[PDB]
Design an enzyme around this catalytic site. Structure first.
Site, mmCIF file in Angstrom:
data_model
loop_
_atom_site.group_PDB
_atom_site.id
_atom_site.type_symbol
_atom_site.label_atom_id
_atom_site.label_comp_id
_atom_site.label_asym_id
_atom_site.label_seq_id
_atom_site.Cartn_x
_atom_site.Cartn_y
_atom_site.Cartn_z
ATOM 1 C CD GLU A 140 -2.942 -1.197 2.308
ATOM 2 O OE1 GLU A 140 -2.763 -0.419 3.277
ATOM 3 O OE2 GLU A 140 -3.836 -2.068 2.301
ATOM 4 C CD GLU A 257 -5.118 -5.361 2.279
ATOM 5 O OE1 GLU A 257 -5.475 -4.195 2.145
ATOM 6 O OE2 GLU A 257 -4.583 -5.761 3.554
HETATM 7 C C1 LIG Z 1 -4.183 -4.649 4.338
HETATM 8 O O1 LIG Z 1 -5.151 -4.414 5.388
HETATM 9 C C2 LIG Z 1 -4.766 -4.758 6.734
HETATM 10 C C3 LIG Z 1 -5.969 -4.932 7.627
HETATM 11 O O2 LIG Z 1 -7.076 -5.222 7.115
HETATM 12 O O3 LIG Z 1 -5.808 -4.798 8.863
HETATM 13 C C4 LIG Z 1 -3.973 -6.067 6.763
HETATM 14 O O4 LIG Z 1 -4.808 -7.141 6.291
HETATM 15 C C5 LIG Z 1 -2.697 -5.980 5.921
HETATM 16 O O5 LIG Z 1 -1.570 -5.810 6.789
HETATM 17 C C6 LIG Z 1 -2.761 -4.846 4.891
HETATM 18 F F1 LIG Z 1 -1.890 -5.094 3.859
#
Ligand SMILES: *[C@H]1O[C@@H](C(=O)O)[C@@H](O)[C@H](O)[C@H]1F
Ligand SMILES: *[C@@H]1O[C@H](CO)[C@@H](O[C@@H]2O[C@H](CO)[C@@H](O[C@@H]3O[C@H](CO[C@H]4O[C@H](CO)[C@@H](O)[C@H](O)[C@@H]4O)[C@@H](O)[C@H](O[C@H]4O[C@H](CO)[C@@H](O)[C@H](O)[C@@H]4O)[C@@H]3O)[C@H](O)[C@H]2NC(C)=O)[C@H](O)[C@H]1NC(C)=O
Ligand SMILES: *[C@@H]1O[C@H](CO)[C@@H](O[C@@H]2O[C@H](CO)[C@@H](O)[C@H](O)[C@H]2NC(C)=O)[C@H](O)[C@H]1NC(C)=O
Ligand SMILES: *[C@@H]1O[C@H](CO)[C@@H](O)[C@H](O)[C@H]1NC(C)=O
Ligand SMILES: [Cl-]
Length: 595
Positions: A140, A257
């Site tokens: 990100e 994700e």
């Molecule tokens: C994307 O989102 C975060 C979250 O949902 O807390 C985590 O899943 C990951 O570290 C991030 F890349």
């Protein structure tokens, strides 16, 4: 009125690819006994059910011009031992050295680090293995998560070129993608949008050549408790990429994700049980059926990842977005950690049984045709026989799921009509069922009264809820037809597995390992790579002290916790597969254990 689920085993439409075999996590650790247990659970999902672990901050496992790779070597060996590949995010400062990617000197250094590490692990594992790795950019980049590293717009492009030229320097066979971010409407997401423009039309930092390699495009889109919203958000982005960057019209898109809800650590009751498990399966069905089922738009969507390999913490052993439930038992001598298989992890083992071709399927209620954008839906697959070790297979995975909402009182009546099963020798079928009443370790933990430091017996009872309810193999009815009218819970998952008898018995279980938990308690883990058939009833485990069968209820997950009443764990262990026809495979190499 009941739901009618119809499946045609004679109509193998298009290939079915297992695009969901990924997980991930972020450190707050990666070498502790906890993580060792976690990745053993992840690796134990049968038939390569989870293949990739997308791990943050991998370049903080390297110290500083030369580099100490000891810790990175540690984590990767751990992955490699569990038959897992790294979602290799080029993410880190090499422990403080890198601070500015608009500094020419540092850009060159990044390239050489990337080449070093790449060549190192090519040397360590073989190029055939390291080519498979999804090397990715920093996570990100539009979310300011850079620590003390200055990453501007220009700096990000320099960084990418160093990444790409570095990996190429190791080998041109290596895969690299990005940005791994959300792609919001501009002026938002400028480094995500900036990267694609750079790869499409910009000039390389090192060669000056127009355009830069970009093997896949990764985005992050979450559904805010809605399942179909994930898919809806991806289409908007994918279509915008298609029109704005014509060279990337065939470039694979990953959502690495694709979680129901942002914020993994936020405790959610639905994250604890089959509610989460069924939603994940629903999301996958939606992606196969409403995106990859030879649609007229047909976007090159190639990877989906539930980012759920985190270890849970007190006081939320089940309620976080994790595949395992962690219990740190602080009152033993000495303190020890235990893990439980959450229904979602077991779900991944059910998705694992789907084979290489999608069969024709239709869900309807009172003649009204329903797509996967509904509370009930199906995925179905067929397998083309390979050698004497395997035969023809049908996998039918039905879900009942109202996303993050559960309905304990509701009984969803479903009628399954399977037809056109190609005739063959020893046609049997086996059902595997999951709901919150029968298969919820969390719910058992609560019947026991929420013990913070569970005793041995409490763990035994808690683990009893891990596996799905399996019915013994029954011969298929004549004409290659099967009709079943089960009553499904909400949430619930049902796999019907129709198998023809292969010529040879199952193959040999391999890579058997013993892992200590505490006194009189141990994890046995293994590999199914040479078993070479998915039609398996259970794994027979035998124990010798100076070999008798360890009696246990049927399971096909490649992990078992041995916790006998006697406490007698010291000796030798062997493991073999047992198919639906009770034909045993050869025993694995014996593993010695002393306490
Ligand atoms: C994307 O989102 C975060 C979250 O949902 O807390 C985590 O899943 C990951 O570290 C991030 F890349
Ligand atoms: C048995 O013994 C083990 C140690 O072996 C104890 O384990 C500790 O448990 C607590 C949880 O109760 C852990 O503390 C919590 O850590 C969470 C994650 O922390 C990391 O990430 C955040 C943000 O990214 C950073 O701030 C932090 O520096 C870490 O890098 C936090 O999210 C938690 O904070 C929240 O909850 C607390 C309540 O305790 C609130 O005060 C806060 O406001 C906040 O909302 C929390 O700090 C700890 O990390 C564990 N340690 C280890 C080594 O595992 C068990 O607790 C113990 N068992 C019992 C029953 O006591
Ligand atoms: C999936 O189904 C939902 C609801 O079943 C659809 O959302 C509806 O879409 C219509 C037309 O765009 C809107 O007018 C409604 O307001 C929506 N209804 C609800 C209850 O939110 C959604 O469009 C469907 N998506 C796909 C991809 O099939
Ligand atoms: C690298 O670091 C590890 C762990 O910090 C340490 O034990 C080791 O001595 C170092 N290795 C080398 C080769 O310098
Ligand atoms: Cl989630």
């Amino acid at each position: 009125a009941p739901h009618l689920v119809q499946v045609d085993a004679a109509r193998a439409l298009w290939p079915l690819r297992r695009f969901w075999r990924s997980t991930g996590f972020c450190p707050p650790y990666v070498l502790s006994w906890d993580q060792q247990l976690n990745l053993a659970y992840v690796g134990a999902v049968p038939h390569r059910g989870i293949k990739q672990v997308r791990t943050h901050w991998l370049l903080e496992l390297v110290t500083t011009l030369s580099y100490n790779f000891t810790h990175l070597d540690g984590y990767l060996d751990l992955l490699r031992e569990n038959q897992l590949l790294p979602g290799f995010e080029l993410m880190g400062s090499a422990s403080g050295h890198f601070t500015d990617f608009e500094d020419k000197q540092q850009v060159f250094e990044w390239k050489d680090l990337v080449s070093s590490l790449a060549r190192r692990y090519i040397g360590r594992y073989g190029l055939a293995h390291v080519s498979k790795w999804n090397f990715e950019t920093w996570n990100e980049p539009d979310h300011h998560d850079f620590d003390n590293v200055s990453m501007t717009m220009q700096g990000f492009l320099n960084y990418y070129d160093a990444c790409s030229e570095g990996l190429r320097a190791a080998s041109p066979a290596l895969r690299l993608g990005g940005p791994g971010d959300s792609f919001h409407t501009p002026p938002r997401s400028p480094l995500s949008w900036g990267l694609l423009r750079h790869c499409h039309d910009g000039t390389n930092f090192f060669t000056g050549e127009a355009g830069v390699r970009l093997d896949y495009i990764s985005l992050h889109r979450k559904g805010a408790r809605s399942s179909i919203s994930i898919l809806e958000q991806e289409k908007v982005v994918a279509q915008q990429i298609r029109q704005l960057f014509p060279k990337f019209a065939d470039t694979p898109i990953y959502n690495d994700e694709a979680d129901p809800l942002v914020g993994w650590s936020l405790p959610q009751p639905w994250r604890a049980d089959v509610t989460y498990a069924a939603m994940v399966v629903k999301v996958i069905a939606q992606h196969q059926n409403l995106l990859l089922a030879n649609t007229t738009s047909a976007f090159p969507y190639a990877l989906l990842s539930n980012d759920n390999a985190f270890l849970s913490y007190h006081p939320h052993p089940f309620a976080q977005r994790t595949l395992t439930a962690r219990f740190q038992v602080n009152n033993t001598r000495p303190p020890h950690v235990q893990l439980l298989r959450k229904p979602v992890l077991t779900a991944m083992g059910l998705l694992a049984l789907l084979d290489e071709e999608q069969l024709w399927a239709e869900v309807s209620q009172a003649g009204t045709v329903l797509d996967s954008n509904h509370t009930v839906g199906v995925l179905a697959s067929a397998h083309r026989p390979q050698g004497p070790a395997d035969a023809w297979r049908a996998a039918v995975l039905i879900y009942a799921s109202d996303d993050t909402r559960a309905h304990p009182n509701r009984s969803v009546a479903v009628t399954l009509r399977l037809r056109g099963v190609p005739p063959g020798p020893g046609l049997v079928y086996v059902t595997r069922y999951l709901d919150n009443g029968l298969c919820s370790p969390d719910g058992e933990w609560r019947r026991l009264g929420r013990p913070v430091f569970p005793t041995a017996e409490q763990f035994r009872r808690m683990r009893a809820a891990e596996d799905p309810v399996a019915a013994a193999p029954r011969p298929l009815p004549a004409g290659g037809r099967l009709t079943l009218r089960p009553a499904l819970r909400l949430p619930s998952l049902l796999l019907v597995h129709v198998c023809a008898r292969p010529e040879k018995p199952p193959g040999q279980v391999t890579r058997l390992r013993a892992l200590p938990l505490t006194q009189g308690q141990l994890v046995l883990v293994w590999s199914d790579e040479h078993v070479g058939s998915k039609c398996l009833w259970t794994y027979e485990i035998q124990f010798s002290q100076d070999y008798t069968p360890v009696s246990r209820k049927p399971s096909t997950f490649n992990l078992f916790v041995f916790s006998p009443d006697t406490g007698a764990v010291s000796g030798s262990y062997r493991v073999r597969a047992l198919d639906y026809w009770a034909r045993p495979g050869p025993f694995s190499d014996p593993v010695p254990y002393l306490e």
